[PDB]
């Protein structure tokens, strides 16, 4: 069958080593990031309320 | 130390410039990743762990 | 070769992130304790001494000249001219409050501390050398060309000095 | 021409790490005495940034450690790293002792004895470091430990006057044990080297036993990433028992302040040891428990002696397995008897654990491999 | 040879093993340690640094520094005076010496905050227990008189008068002060200072089991890779006669 | 030294095997290893259980029976 | 069936010193090396038994350095013989560097490279162990060399804050110097082992420059023996250099507790930098002497690659020779300098110096030996 | 915990003041130097320290 949109992608980034570590990179740069931001915001999300930086209005800007 | 010189050498550094100019850049950006290098952070409209 | 590629690059994007963690944390426990922490740009004591006198409140464990300097002292500055210093430098640009000082007491060389109330300007008398300085501690003989470094301060709380 | 073959230290590496022959039918229990390895350089920079603020005074340590746990950023992980860390090392350590002791690789005379020596030296360091932490155990542990060498008739009571530097625990003893336990470690890391170096010269062992000389494989493409993954593994099992486990592994009664006058409830040595202190309890005379206790670690060198059944290992031998079982089973006794505040059944307890600790291997275990070789004209 | 009584656990909110300490009932508990909390026992390990992120900002953590003053050190001359109260300094100095306390409580010294939900077997919960354990004596049993007996206390008879009471310390929260409440306060915030990285480790090692989840599969991926060559195999034996 | 290139006799012994690419790496990896995972257990769960199971008796034996001997005390030191 | 040759355990040092053939001529100079390696293990043994006693925050420092000098059983004698033993082992030291750059050993590659790194880890362990005493000059001196990583326009200032632990020099930073010292030197054991790793198989060499490939000599008789008398002479420069004048080579001249404000009159390490501290000196701007600093020393690896020389030893070729013994008196106009505070007629003389040093290696003697290439008609 | 005793052997010469700032107030700003390393911790020597009080 025609190839898969992976199976190019072989021919691209990844068949080539120093753009294989380059995607490596970039990849690290997203994934630091997004995980990074998505483990914020869940453990934010999870236990509610014990969090104080919700509670800081009791005592921010008057 | 001339042995350098050489016809081949200078189609061969031709050749071998791609693989390894890569490699500085993918070297270059991910040691800015590694020290988390500041002004061009600023400049990517993503990843921006500031607030 | 794309799919098994494709997790060979996976696992190495999660490994040099986790890299990039761990390492930091190692790099994070030299670099800083909180004690020290706390010890950084903190020392809320402005006009702790009576005008004229120059004392030495302690930061980065080095200690620090700070003096409510008189006005007359800032006339002291005044006086001088400008281009008979080696390094043109009147007072009111070197501080904030020209009644108010901090100094170093490193020099450029061997890094030795002039003696407070001592000096013919003045201000301060330095042994290791025989340079001489006004109120502003202001440079004037040589070796070193440079005044005797000021490090940016603010008074957060006005009586609350907190150089940094 | 050769890139490995060139650089003769390079030739040492692929002689070694880089493609030594090894058999392929290794399982997990060979991945974990490089496990040790790895557990081991992982111990040394922890307790190198540790050792970034430590103190080893009688007075101002204490109060460093709580600059540790408190003011340095992260440091605390560094800290239960080092501890819990250490402690995954035993554990590692012991699953290894018993690997090489089940499936015979104690055959491997010279480098067996390497690893008792390197056995006891870790027995020391890991004794020293829990010493100077400087708290409750650290101080009523570290001296009752020590008397026991004054069991001696006439030398050992002197010698405890030797380490202490003086009357008692002091910052004279907590120094040389803060200085012994740094130095023990490097020389740890030389005996693994020689080691090894021992084990490249005969072969490793195989999980069979019998030998596969004739299906020795590449270490590099396949073993590597094996104990990569097994490395990754234990580094699951160590933070998921510090960053949600961080204290239970230890004693807490450190975390008071040692006195010389305030005397704690019932002082449990920590866990490692927990089975040679019930050792202390199995005999009157302190002088015997002390011949014991040292005996307990020296009996291993007998068995390669006292080996006679035909395996090389024990998997194919589930009766001399059994015995086996019932010596692990023994030592999980000597444990738990050991974790225990002193008592009466608890002594016949560990009585009798303690004769049949050294019987399976003094009596059952040449002997029925005697029988066991009678069944089958062996 | 008599047993210490062995308190019974109890589920606390930060027992759960995704479960954080909320800066709430810290606060509290610490507004219980600003006065009531005084008689002293210790906290001087811990200064009024860890407060400021917890529930305080700086100058408010400064604010909450000044409320008592230790001494400043001798200067140029000028020996021993009181700074106002940075959040540098640190908790108040118990007593000039612990000896004091030992002749201001029968020669048993009160200790530290610091360590006794970590050193203490059966932990912050027992503190919570003993605070709320003083039953009264069964007949035949002796006491000191300066002694209050409970049993979690180990010798039975503890020296400390029960400083907690119905409505201790009203809060400047406004939030009732039921002797069970202010204590689960005291021990919340007790738990706070015995270990002051707790809430931020959890989220670093929740985020750890994720990325040991994501790595432990994957990594299993490519020993299987390298080694199906091998499990693969087949082999055969053809003898030249 | 021992390395490969001179060690044991062997002959006509044959290998076939394939490039890690060409397969997939999961040839029926559950359904394969279940009964296997299954069998090594009923084989060795016979020479492994009792001394665990032994231990276990004897530590509550112990623990419950000296608890007995513990906070049964005062009816056992009469009045 | 050799004890020696067949059993692995030793069969390294049947490589080694058992029985290396070695060159028939061999002066004293080639016995300084393992003169020196003799000076490292008592460097070791020393500085262990002085941590035995030794600890230091900020508080318990100087104190207990003077625990060490009167307080501690032969402390005096210790840290007397340990102070002496730098200079000395440096004594060992840079003659065998000397000796280097003569003979031409620096034929053989790696053991070169090699070497030099162990020059400056020993460089930065000995300015680390400085530290220790925390006399004024371990104070002023650690401020200075510290604020040498400066040069850096970024990332120095802050490599130096973080060396430091914070901003300021403290405990802290101590106590990092303390145990960087006190773990650096077993690396620089490591390294000097895989030294002489690289020279086994290369064989050795020879004062004449010709390889004795055809008269080389068994070690054991011979170059052993040379090796214990060379130890009882070092070992007599050296109890006569501290036992009667412990401050003489010695010089830290600041028992003086280190304080902020406290600033010696000479904030100068001893002679074995000053030389090289001297060249800060002679260039302006701290920057070209910090980049001296290092290349200065770092040019050493460049040495064998513009060697111009058809032959080994420098003893056939005079004029470089002249133009080396000239160099001689660079480095101990150097170290003259470098007791001699800043001043003009020594800033004539110090860019003078720089210069000498420059053109006397950098240019001059392959020059001359192609002057003499000419000459021999090479 | 304040008291006097008359204090063994073992002890050390006394503080000449409570407080360093005493000394720095008796010759004020400029406290008196440890003596019994003094003479080592000056550049000369015996002769160097002698000559210091000779003249
Ligand atoms: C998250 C995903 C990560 C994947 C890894 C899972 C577990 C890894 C593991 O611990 O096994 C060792 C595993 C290597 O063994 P293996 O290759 O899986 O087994 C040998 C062959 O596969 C041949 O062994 P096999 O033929 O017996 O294979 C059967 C079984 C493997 O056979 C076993 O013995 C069971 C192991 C898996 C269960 C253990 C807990 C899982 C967590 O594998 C399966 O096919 C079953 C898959 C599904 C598991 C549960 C099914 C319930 C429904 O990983 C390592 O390389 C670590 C080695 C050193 C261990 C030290 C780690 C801590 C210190
Ligand atoms: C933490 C403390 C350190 C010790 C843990 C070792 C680290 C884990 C590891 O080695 O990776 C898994 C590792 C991967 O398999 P492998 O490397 O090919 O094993 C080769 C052994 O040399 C060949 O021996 P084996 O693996 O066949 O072990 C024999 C075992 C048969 O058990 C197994 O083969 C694996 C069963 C464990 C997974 C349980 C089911 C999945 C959940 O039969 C028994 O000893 C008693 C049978 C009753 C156990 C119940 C098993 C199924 C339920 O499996 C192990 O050898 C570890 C022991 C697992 C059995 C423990 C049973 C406890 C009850
Ligand atoms: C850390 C810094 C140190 C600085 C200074 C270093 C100094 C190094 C000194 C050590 C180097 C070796 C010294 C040189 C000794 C010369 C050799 C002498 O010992 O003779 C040897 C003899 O050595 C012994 O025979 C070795 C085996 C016997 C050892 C028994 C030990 C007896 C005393 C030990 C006392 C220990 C008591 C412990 C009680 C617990 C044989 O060698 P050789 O030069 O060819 O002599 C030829 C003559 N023959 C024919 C007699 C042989
Ligand atoms: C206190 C807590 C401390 C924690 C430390 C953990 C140590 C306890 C180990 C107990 C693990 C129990 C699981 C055993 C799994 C099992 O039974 O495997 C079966 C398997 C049989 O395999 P085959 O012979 O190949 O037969 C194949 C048949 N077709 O048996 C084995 O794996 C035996 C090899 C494993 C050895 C490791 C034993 C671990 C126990 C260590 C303690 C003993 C060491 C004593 C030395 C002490 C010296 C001071
Ligand atoms: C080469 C291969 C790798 C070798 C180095 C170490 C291998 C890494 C294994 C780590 C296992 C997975 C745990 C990762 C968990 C994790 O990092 O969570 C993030 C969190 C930090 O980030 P956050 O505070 O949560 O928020 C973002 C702040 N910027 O990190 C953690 O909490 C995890 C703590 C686990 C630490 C394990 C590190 C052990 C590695 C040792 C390497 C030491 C070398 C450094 C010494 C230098 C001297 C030359
Ligand atoms: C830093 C230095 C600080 C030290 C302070 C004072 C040191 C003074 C050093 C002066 C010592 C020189 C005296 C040497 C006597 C001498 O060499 O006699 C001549 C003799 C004749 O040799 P042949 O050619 O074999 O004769 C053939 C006949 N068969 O020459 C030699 O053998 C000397 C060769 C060995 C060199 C040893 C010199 C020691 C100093 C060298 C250090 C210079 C390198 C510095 C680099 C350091 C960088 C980190
Ligand atoms: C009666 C004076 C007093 C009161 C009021 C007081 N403390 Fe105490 N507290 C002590 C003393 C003294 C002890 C231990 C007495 C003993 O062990 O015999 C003690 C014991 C304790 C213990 C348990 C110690 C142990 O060994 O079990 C806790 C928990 C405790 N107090 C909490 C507090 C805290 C926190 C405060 C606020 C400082 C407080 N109580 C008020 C002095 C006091
Ligand atoms: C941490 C220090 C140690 C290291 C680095 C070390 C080397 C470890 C490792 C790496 C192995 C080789 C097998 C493998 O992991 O793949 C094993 C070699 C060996 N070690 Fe040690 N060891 C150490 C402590 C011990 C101890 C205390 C003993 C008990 C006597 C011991 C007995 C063996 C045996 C028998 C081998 C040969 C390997 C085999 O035949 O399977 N080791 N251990
Ligand atoms: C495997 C061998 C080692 C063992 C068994 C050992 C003992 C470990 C363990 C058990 C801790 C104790 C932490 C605690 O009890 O709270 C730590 C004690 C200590 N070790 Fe080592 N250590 C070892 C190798 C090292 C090395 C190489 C260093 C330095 C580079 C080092 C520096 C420390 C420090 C500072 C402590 C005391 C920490 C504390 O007070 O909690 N250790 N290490
Ligand atoms: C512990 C430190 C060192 C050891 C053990 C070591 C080995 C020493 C000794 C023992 C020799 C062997 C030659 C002989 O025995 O006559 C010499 C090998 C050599 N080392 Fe190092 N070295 C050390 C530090 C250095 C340094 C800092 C340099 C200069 C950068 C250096 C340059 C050489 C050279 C050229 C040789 C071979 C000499 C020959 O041809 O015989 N060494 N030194
Ligand atoms: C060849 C390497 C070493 C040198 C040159 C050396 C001398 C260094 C430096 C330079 C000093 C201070 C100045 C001096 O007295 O010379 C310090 C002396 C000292 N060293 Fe070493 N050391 C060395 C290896 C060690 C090691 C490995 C330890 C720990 C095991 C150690 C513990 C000390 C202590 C406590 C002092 C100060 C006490 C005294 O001698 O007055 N040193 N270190
Ligand atoms: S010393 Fe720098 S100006 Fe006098």
Redesign the interface.
């Known amino acids: 069958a025609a190839p898969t949109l992976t199976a190019r992608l072989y021919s691209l980034l990844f068949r080539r080593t120093s753009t294989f570590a380059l995607t490596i990179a970039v990849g690290a740069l997203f994934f630091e990031r997004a995980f990074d931001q998505g483990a914020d915001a869940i453990y934010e999300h999870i236990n509610q309320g014990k969090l104080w930086k919700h509670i800081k209005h009791k005592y921010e800007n008057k | 130390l001339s042995r350098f010189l050489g016809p081949r050498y200078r189609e061969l550094a031709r050749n071998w410039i791609?693989?390894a100019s890569?490699?500085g850049?993918?070297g270059a950006?991910?040691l800015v990743?590694?020290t988390?290098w500041r002004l061009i952070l600023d400049w990517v409209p993503?990843?921006?762990?500031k607030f | 070769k794309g799919f098994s590629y494709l997790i060979t690059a996976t696992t190495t994007v999660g490994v040099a992130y986790a890299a990039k963690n761990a390492v930091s944390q190692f790099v994070s426990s030299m670099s800083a304790s909180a004690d020290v922490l706390a010890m950084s740009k903190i020392e809320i004591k402005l006009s702790d001494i009576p005008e004229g006198k120059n004392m030495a409140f302690k930061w980065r464990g080095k200690p620090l000249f700070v003096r409510h300097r008189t006005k007359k002292e800032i006339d002291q500055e005044a006086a001088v001219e400008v281009s008979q210093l080696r390094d043109p430098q009147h007072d009111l640009e070197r501080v904030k409050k020209p009644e108010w000082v901090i100094l170093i007491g490193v020099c450029t060389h061997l890094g030795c501390v002039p003696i407070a109330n001592a000096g013919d300007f003045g201000g301060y008398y330095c042994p290791c050398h025989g340079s001489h300085y006004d109120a502003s501690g202001r440079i004037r003989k040589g070796p070193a060309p440079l005044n005797l470094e000021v490090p940016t301060y603010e008074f957060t709380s006005d009586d609350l000095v907190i150089v940094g | 021409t050769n890139i490995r073959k060139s650089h003769p230290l390079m030739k040492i590496i692929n002689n070694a790490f880089i493609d030594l022959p090894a058999p392929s039918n290794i399982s997990s229990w060979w991945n974990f005495g490089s496990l040790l390895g790895i557990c081991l350089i992982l111990q040394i920079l922890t307790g190198l940034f540790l050792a970034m603020h430590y103190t080893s005074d009688t007075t101002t340590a204490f109060s460093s450690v709580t600059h540790i746990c408190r003011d340095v950023n992260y440091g605390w992980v560094i800290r239960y790293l080092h501890a819990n860390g250490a402690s995954m090392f035993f554990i590692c350590l012991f699953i290894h002792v018993g690997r090489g002791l089940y499936y015979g690789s104690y055959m491997f005379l010279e480098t067996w004895n390497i690893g008792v020596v390197l056995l006891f030296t870790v027995m020391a360091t890991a004794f020293m470091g829990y010493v100077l932490p400087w708290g409750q155990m650290s101080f009523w542990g570290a001296t009752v430990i020590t008397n026991l060498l004054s069991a001696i008739p006439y030398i050992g009571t002197d010698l405890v006057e030797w380490i202490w530097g003086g009357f008692s625990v002091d910052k004279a003893t907590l120094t040389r044990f803060f200085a012994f336990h740094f130095i023990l470690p490097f020389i740890i890391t030389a005996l693994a080297a020689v080691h090894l170096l021992f084990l490249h010269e005969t072969g490793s062992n195989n999980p069979t036993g019998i030998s596969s000389d004739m299906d020795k494989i590449p270490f590099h493409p396949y073993y590597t990433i094996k104990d990569i993954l097994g490395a990754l593994f234990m580094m699951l099992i160590l933070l998921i028992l510090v960053l949600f486990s961080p204290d239970l592994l230890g004693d807490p009664d450190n975390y008071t302040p040692a006195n010389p006058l305030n005397t704690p409830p019932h002082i449990k040595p920590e866990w490692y040891f927990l089975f040679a202190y019930a050792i202390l309890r199995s005999i009157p005379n302190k002088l015997g428990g002390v011949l014991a206790l040292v005996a307990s670690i020296l009996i291993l060198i007998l068995m390669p002696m006292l080996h006679t059944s035909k395996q090389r290992s024990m998997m194919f031998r589930p009766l001399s397995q059994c015995l086996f079982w019932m010596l692990v089973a023994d030592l999980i006794t000597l444990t738990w008897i050991g974790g225990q505040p002193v008592e009466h059944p608890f002594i016949i307890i560990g009585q009798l654990a303690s004769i049949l600790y050294f019987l399976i291997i003094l009596v059952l275990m040449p002997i029925t491999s005697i029988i066991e070789n009678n069944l089958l004209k062996w | 040879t008599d047993l210490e009584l062995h308190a019974p656990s109890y589920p606390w909110s930060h027992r759960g093993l995704l479960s954080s300490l909320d800066h709430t009932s810290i606060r509290r508990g610490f507004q219980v340690y600003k006065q009531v909390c005084s008689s002293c026992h210790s906290m001087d390990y811990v200064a009024y640094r860890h407060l400021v992120g917890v529930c305080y900002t700086e100058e408010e953590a400064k604010a909450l520094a000044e409320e008592v003053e230790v001494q400043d050190g001798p200067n140029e001359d000028g020996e021993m005076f009181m700074r106002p109260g940075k959040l540098s300094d640190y908790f108040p100095k118990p007593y000039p010496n612990p000896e004091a306390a030992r002749a201001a409580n029968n020669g048993a010294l009160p200790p530290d905050l610091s360590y006794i939900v970590r050193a203490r077997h059966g932990g912050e919960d027992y503190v919570f227990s003993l605070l709320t354990g003083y039953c009264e004596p069964p007949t035949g049993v002796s006491l000191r008189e300066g002694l209050y007996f409970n049993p979690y206390f180990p010798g039975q008879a503890i020296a400390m008068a029960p400083p907690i009471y119905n409505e201790v310390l009203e809060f400047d929260d406004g939030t009732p002060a039921t002797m069970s409440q202010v204590a689960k306060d005291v021990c919340t915030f007790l738990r706070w200072a015995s270990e002051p990285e707790h809430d931020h480790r959890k989220r670093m090692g929740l985020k750890m089991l994720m990325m040991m989840g994501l790595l432990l599969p994957l990594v299993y991926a490519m020993k299987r890779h390298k080694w199906s060559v091998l499990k693969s195999r087949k082999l055969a034996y053809r003898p030249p006669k | 030294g021992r390395e490969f290139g001179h060690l044991t006799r062997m002959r006509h012994v044959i290998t076939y095997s394939l490039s890690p690419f060409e397969q997939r790496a999961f040839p029926h990896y559950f359904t394969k290893g279940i009964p296997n995972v299954l069998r090594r257990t009923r084989a060795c769960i016979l020479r492994v259980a009792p001394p665990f199971v032994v231990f276990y008796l004897v530590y509550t034996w112990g623990t419950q029976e000296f608890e007995k001997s513990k906070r049964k005390n005062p009816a056992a030191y009469e009045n």
């Open positions: 791609p693989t890569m490699w850049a993918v950006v991910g990743w590694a988390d993503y990843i921006n762990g």
